[PDB]
Amino acid sequence: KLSLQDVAELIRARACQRVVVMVGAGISTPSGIPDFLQQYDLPYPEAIFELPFFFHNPKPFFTLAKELYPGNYKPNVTHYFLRLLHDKGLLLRLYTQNIDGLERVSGIPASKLVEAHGTFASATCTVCQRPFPGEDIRADVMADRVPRCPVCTGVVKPDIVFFGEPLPQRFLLHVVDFPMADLLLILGTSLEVEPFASLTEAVRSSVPRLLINRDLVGPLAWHPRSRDVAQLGDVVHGVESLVELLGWTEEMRDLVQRET
């Protein structure tokens, strides 16, 4: 096995400069966003991202949308470390399962992001499929009213991907990004679930896979490879020690006070 310092030295050298990153809920809880009775009036947790429930009752989802609008949460060190990889020309693609939009907020350009469970930044009429900037429904949501299509009256839904829905078109970038990956960084998610779990195996056997996660689970556990590295513990701590090892301490502080 390699160590956190080796990976750090591989990046520091720029021997690694096409980094593919995959992130999940573990990077958001330090911003104070929860992951999980639940006061939202749901029959079960997943009903909040099901289309028939939503058609029957769009209110709980809109309560979450209102809560996740810009200004409730800020990015944390983990997002700002990813922004630094971008600023140093190292980021090939950032794949995110979160819907808090904090990757964009930390100033990572959209062209670098695959928001694989979608985004509140835009919205779509559930009936006639007309697209709308998320601004267009902001006031309705911010007032607890259900936003409606100005042509057909259909409920207008923010472009969060619900159960049973195709992943967004930009997800198709995985077909080129994962063979091109010279390094795979997995932060705050186990990636237990398809198609994300297989993506961990789409990189080239020569390519290190660095997990910064609490425990060691998922396909990094199930089908480990020679050049895997685990850095288990608090994600924030792990990223900070990676940052430390890269020598990016000052750059991190600079970026954090520039942005926040």
Partner: peptide, 5 residues
């Protein structure tokens, strides 16, 4: 098939 889940 890539769908959410």
């Amino acid at each position: 098939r890539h769908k959410k889940x």
